Design a protein around this ligand. Structure first.
Ligand SMILES: Nc1ncnc2c1ncn2[C@@H]1O[C@H](COP(=O)(O)OP(=O)(O)OP(=O)(O)O)[C@@H](O)[C@H]1O
Ligand SMILES: Nc1ncnc2c1ncn2[C@@H]1O[C@H](COP(=O)(O)OP(=O)(O)O)[C@@H](O)[C@H]1O
Lengths: 223, 689, 250
């Protein structure tokens, strides 16, 4: 009858949803996930009005609607934000024991992301702040690993260092910004790295402050 | 005629023509009505009117009011003849006239019309230095030693490089009354070359020209050009297009735009006549003497045509009713919201409906009679008329969501808030480059800008200036916002205030983007290469390819002119005030203060059933009940307190001065203090009881 | 009866402590008289001839302020009340140094720190105070630093169960119990409306009416101590005597 037909359609939709949820979280593409969820919703809407009044169909449709709503949270979760420590915080707060390698969208969808929106958003914001500071340390690291001291010949005797203003401005800016993250709240995560880089910058500053004076006095006495 | 007093007004040209007719013996145009300046000399040796050489053009429906399209007219053809005459002898020339009169764009058209001329546009800022000219020569030209001396010529062969330098008088004079770039141009024009600082030798220019354009020197920030430089450069006064030219150009534009819907082809001419009449009358009043932002130009009518075209683009089968409704709405949004006094506003509205009836009397008075005349694509799927109540409910729900997600402070929607939200949305939707907001501090300009940006999916970028800011950081942030808007299709809404701007270097970088949509001076070296690379990646996202690097920059520019919308604010420049759609976000009116007090004191318990209704005490004319209750009386007393602070400040200014401005933030503070103190005292007395 | 007459008194006191700043004594009195006259015209039951000095602060705070090196002027007491109950951070304007010394002795327990806009370490002291909930005082507010806009606006980027505030490109935790007191030396300074809206102006400048009131109070205290005692009794009769009776009842 009509009930048997709607049960068969519900079974087909459930099979489609389970087959899609078999996709591991690593390989779940949010854009394609949204497109396929929209296709499933359109398939559901293609059912006749008599079949649409059944409670099971309404429950499946509202579950898919909730998945579409939390699709933004899916996009935000599958970024370079979470890494695995923030995932560990999410596991600790949600009291669920998943496997990172075996993680699939089905496990995450079973846990109510809509109900846990506050926890998820807090974890995402913490992951955002860390990325910014970590990237900044990486920048500083790249700049000071790719920095070369310019040398210019002096009367065919030696090659004195040219570009004191640029180097001193860079050092001062970096020192001020190092103090700046030392003021940051997310700084406790990168505390030791910031301390080490500050020590390196202080050593550089103290070396070049004496070096410029030695260069100036040396050229004066050479003349 | 065209050299003597060729840089003066029409009246002075006519006066010189009359004097010459009096003194000369040569035959002159026999017509006593048309001034001689409107005639020309044919190769046969007879005076022929300039009208006969004006062709009738029919621009595409999809190109109506295009930023670069040109409609030939009498002024355009006369100036085109003069430019060809003065470029044949390679004499640099300057087009001087009021903002928006049609100098820069017409100069682009005339220069690009020639096939053997390469045009380079340089925007002379207030900090312009000859280093800019040297950089342009390095980028476009090469140094050649084979002739007698070192020679600077464009890389392209057979091409005369025109260095179009608009805003030529803008660069600042030094402490001793001279402009370095002006002197550089004078040296390179009179002598024909310059000394390069690399090895101190005289390089000679070949195949390099100069062309300029500027606002009148009397305008703010404009320095008169040196006589030694002015001796070489003839100047032409390109004044505001006359009623005839305006009617012709915008009749052509209307005839092109209305071809989308065939039901209103016959109404194109009366519509154009109505627009030009309203523009003329709105230019007669609201002179710059009354307010600095009361500047009117054919740019206003161009925006007027463009808005009507945008509103009619998706809509099909529109009667004359909707056409005149959209005409009136655009007139309201362009000629009415920039105003300050309510008398001016009502004058504008009465003039609008009067003109609508003058050229459309047969129509029913229901479109203009309708008071709200506010549209919103938010309701339904397109830009259609919408009633105020349904829109109010929708925006209240959306703002509920909004102050649930960021901006935790509550907001009350009085009618002014709704109007300003609609205006800001209208500006954001169109592919424009700025929305400048002027109003008293704390009234809510930035808040509503952020709210509309949140609705329309606009990202928010605010520069957090400190005491140690610099121009380099500001330019870097500009380029960052551009790359987020050009390299990525993400639509940004840059939010800045007068506090962030310190020097004029932070300014005119706006104006060039507002009139153009790009700032060439920001992209150089590795930054320009990274811009092209990220633009290539964005093209891959859009489906394009590397294509041409210059075409990558062009795609960046198009994305910026379509996506980016910088919004900037002051408390209450003749150019920035015309490149922006200026919306007057005045201090909250009595009704606004009443609504603020009512909703922000709602939680307070002030229900006194035995309240004896008094007489007088009128502050809010629209008291919710005719006999006020305790709550209404208290809110009326609060708005009366605010009005009394306003009056006390005005009186203190009258007798001596030394006053501090009263802002709506003060009203919010007063209401918050009232609620907190009332709650504390009530709780203490209840505890004692 | 007191419950019947609460709303008008609260309205008057809030309007006084929110609007009637930066005004001299006669201007404040005129504004309060106008507000009370309007409330009478509106038949709003506010306590007649209310005095704002003890309505917003009973005896103990007044004695503590007096022990905190604060002048006994009525204008000074009103300014101290404004300093105690403020929503926007106050901007002290005092030709003398009495107000700075008072606000300094008042917040010694909280480790109030001296700083000025002209100092290059002003920003560093700012974030240092903003971290541990340390009150901060800034002088020479004529050269106002725009970096204070986020903190004056009280913008809160609360996220993840914690409070945030953005200072330039840097983000800092908005520690609780943090107050900043802008101060100045020049009585005649024209602040921009952007700064004017974000602060509660607290004027200590001596004018004709303020000095006249000081001289009248001094001569009443000296020549006729009985009248001064009766006036103090009248002032206490609103809150202090009732508080003493309530304590004796307890
Ligand atoms: N004769 C005309 N032909 C075509 N467009 C015109 C004409 N007159 C005015 N316009 C229009 O008016 C506006 C004038 O813009 P344009 O940039 O040329 O002004 P401007 O006075 O040179 O400006 P600025 O001094 O700010 O550079 C444009 O929208 C242009 O399309
Ligand atoms: N319609 C409104 N209702 C309630 N509060 C408002 C309204 N408009 C503005 N405000 C308040 O004004 C404060 C600051 O306004 P802001 O946008 O900074 O003004 P401006 O743009 O002039 O700087 C905000 O905290 C906001 O709460």
């Amino acid at each position: 009858q009509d009930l048997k037909g709607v049960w068969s359609e519900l079974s087909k939709v459930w099979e489609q949803i389970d087959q899609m949820k078999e996709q591991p979280w690593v390989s779940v593409q949010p854009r394609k996930l949204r497109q396929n969820l929209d296709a499933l919703l359109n398939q559901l809407k293609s059912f006749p009005a008599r079949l649409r009044q059944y409670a099971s169909y309404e429950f499946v449709q509202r579950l898919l609607k909730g998945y579409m709503k939390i699709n933004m949270l899916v996009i935000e979760l599958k970024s370079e934000a979470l890494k695995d420590r923030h995932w560990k915080q999410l596991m600790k707060r949600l009291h669920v024991n998943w496997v990172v390698s075996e993680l699939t969208l089905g496990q995450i969808w079973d846990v109510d992301l809509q109900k846990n929106e506050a926890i998820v958003k807090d974890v995402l914001l913490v992951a955002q702040g860390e990325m910014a500071l970590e990237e900044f340390l990486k920048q500083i690291r790249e700049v000071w690993n790719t920095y070369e001291l310019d040398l210019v010949n002096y009367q065919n005797k030696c090659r004195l260092i040219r570009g004191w203003d640029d180097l001193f401005n860079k050092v001062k800016e970096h020192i001020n910004s190092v103090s700046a993250m030392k003021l940051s709240p997310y700084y406790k995560v990168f505390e030791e790295d910031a301390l080490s880089w500050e020590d390196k910058l202080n050593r550089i500053m103290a070396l070049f402050d004496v070096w410029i004076d030695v260069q100036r006095r040396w050229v004066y006495l050479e003349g | 005629l065209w050299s003597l007093s060729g840089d003066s007004r029409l009246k002075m040209r006519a006066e010189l023509g009359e004097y010459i007719r009096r003194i000369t013996t040569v035959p002159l145009p026999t017509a006593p009505n048309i001034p001689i300046i409107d005639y020309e000399v044919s190769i046969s040796g007879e005076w022929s009117p300039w009208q006969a050489k004006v062709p009738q053009i029919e621009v595409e429906t999809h190109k109506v009011a295009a930023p670069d399209v040109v409609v030939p007219t009498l002024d355009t053809v006369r100036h085109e003849a003069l430019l060809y005459t003065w470029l044949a002898e390679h004499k640099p020339l300057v087009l001087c006239g009021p903002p928006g009169s049609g100098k820069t764009m017409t100069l682009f058209s005339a220069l690009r019309a020639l096939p053997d001329m390469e045009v380079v546009g340089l925007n002379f800022s207030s900090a312009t230095t000859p280093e800019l000219l040297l950089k342009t020569f390095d980028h476009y030209c090469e140094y050649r030693r084979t002739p007698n001396g070192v020679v600077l010529a464009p890389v392209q062969l057979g091409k005369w490089l025109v260095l179009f330098c608009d805003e030529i008088n803008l660069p600042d004079m030094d402490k001793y009354g001279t402009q370095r770039v002006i002197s550089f141009i004078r040296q390179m024009v009179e002598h024909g070359g310059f000394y390069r600082t690399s090895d101190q030798t005289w390089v000679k220019l070949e195949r390099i020209q100069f062309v300029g354009a500027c606002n009148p020197p009397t305008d703010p920030g404009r320095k008169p050009l040196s006589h030694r430089f002015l001796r070489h450069v003839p100047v032409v006064y390109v004044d505001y297009p006359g009623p005839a030219s305006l009617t012709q150009i915008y009749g052509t534009f209307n005839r092109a735009m209305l071809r989308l819907i065939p039901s209103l082809r016959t109404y194109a001419e009366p519509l154009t006549a109505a627009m030009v009449e309203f523009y003329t009358m709105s230019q007669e009043r609201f002179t710059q003497d009354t307010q600095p932002h009361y500047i009117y130009s054919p740019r206003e009518m161009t925006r007027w045509v463009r808005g009507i075209f945008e509103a009619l683009r998706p809509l099909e089968t529109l009667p004359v009713e909707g056409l005149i409704r959209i005409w009136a709405h655009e007139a309201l949004r362009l000629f009415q919201d920039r105003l300050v006094e309510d008398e001016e506003r009502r004058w504008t509205d009465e003039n609008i409906d009067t003109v609508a009836l003058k050229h459309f009397p047969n129509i029913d008075r229901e479109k203009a009679m309708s008071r709200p005349i506010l549209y919103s694509n938010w309701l339904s799927k397109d830009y259609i008329p919408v009633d105020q109540e349904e829109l109010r409910d929708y925006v209240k729900a959306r703002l509920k969501v909004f102050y649930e997600e960021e901006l935790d402070v509550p907001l009350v929607l009085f009618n002014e808030v709704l109007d300003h939200v609609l205006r800001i949305d209208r500006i954001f939707r169109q592919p424009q480059g700025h929305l400048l907001l002027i109003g008293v501090s704390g009234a809510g300009k930035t808040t509503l800008s952020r709210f509309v940006a949140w609705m329309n999916g606009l990202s928010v970028y605010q520069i957090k200036v400190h005491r140690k800011y610099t121009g380099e950081d500001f330019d870097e942030d500009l380029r960052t916002v551009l790359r987020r808007s050009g390299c990525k299709n993400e639509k940004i809404a840059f939010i800045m205030d007068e506090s962030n701007v310190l020097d004029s270097g932070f300014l005119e970088r706006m104006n060039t983007l507002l009139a153009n949509g790009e700032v060439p001076g920001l992209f150089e070296g590795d930054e320009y290469a990274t811009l092209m690379t990220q633009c290539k990646e964005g093209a891959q996202k859009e489906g394009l390819m590397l294509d041409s690097h210059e075409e990558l920059y062009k795609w960046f520019t198009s994305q910026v002119i379509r996506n980016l919308h910088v919004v900037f604010t002051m408390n209450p420049s003749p150019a920035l005030f015309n490149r922006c759609v200026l919306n007057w976000f005045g201090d909250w009116s009595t009704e606004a203060l009443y609504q603020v007090g009512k909703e922000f004191t709602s939680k307070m318990d002030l229900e006194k059933p035995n309240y004896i209704v008094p007489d007088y005490m009128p502050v809010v004319y629209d008291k919710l009940p005719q006999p006020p209750s305790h709550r209404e009386a208290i809110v009326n007393s609060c708005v009366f307190v605010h009005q009394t602070l306003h009056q006390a400040n005005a009186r203190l200014a009258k007798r001596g001065g030394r006053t501090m401005a009263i802002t709506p933030r003060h009203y919010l503070d007063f209401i918050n203090h009232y609620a907190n103190l009332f709650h504390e005292k009530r709780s203490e007395l209840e505890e004692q009881q | 009866n007191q419950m019947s007459t609460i709303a008008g008194d609260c309205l008057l006191s809030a309007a006084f402590i929110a609007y009637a700043g930066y005004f001299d004594q006669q201007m404040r009195q005129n504004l309060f008289t106008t507000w009370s006259h309007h409330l009478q015209q509106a038949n709003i039951q506010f306590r007649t001839d209310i005095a704002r000095t003890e309505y917003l602060s009973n005896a103990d705070e007044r004695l503590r302020w007096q022990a905190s090196s604060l002048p006994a002027d009525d204008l000074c007491t009103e300014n101290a009340i404004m300093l105690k109950r403020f929503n926007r951070y106050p901007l002290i304007i005092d030709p003398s140094g009495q107000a700075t010394e008072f606000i300094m002795n008042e917040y010694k327990d909280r480790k109030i720190t001296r700083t000025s806009f002209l100092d290059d370490a002003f920003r560093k002291n700012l974030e240092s105070a903003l971290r541990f909930g340390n009150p901060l005082l800034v002088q020479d507010v004529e050269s106002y630093d725009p970096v204070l806009n986020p903190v004056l606006n009280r913008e809160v980027r609360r996220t993840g169960g914690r409070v945030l505030i953005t200072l330039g490109d840097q983000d800092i935790d908005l520690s609780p119990s943090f107050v900043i007191f802008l101060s100045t030396r020049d009585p005649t300074v024209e602040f921009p409306p952007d700064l004017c809206s974000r602060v509660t102006f607290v004027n200590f400048t001596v004018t004709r009416s303020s000095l006249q009131s000081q001289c009248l109070n001094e001569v009443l205290k000296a020549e006729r101590p009985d009248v001064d005692e009766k006036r103090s009794d009248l002032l206490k009769l609103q809150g202090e005597f009732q508080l003493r009776l309530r304590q004796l009842e307890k």
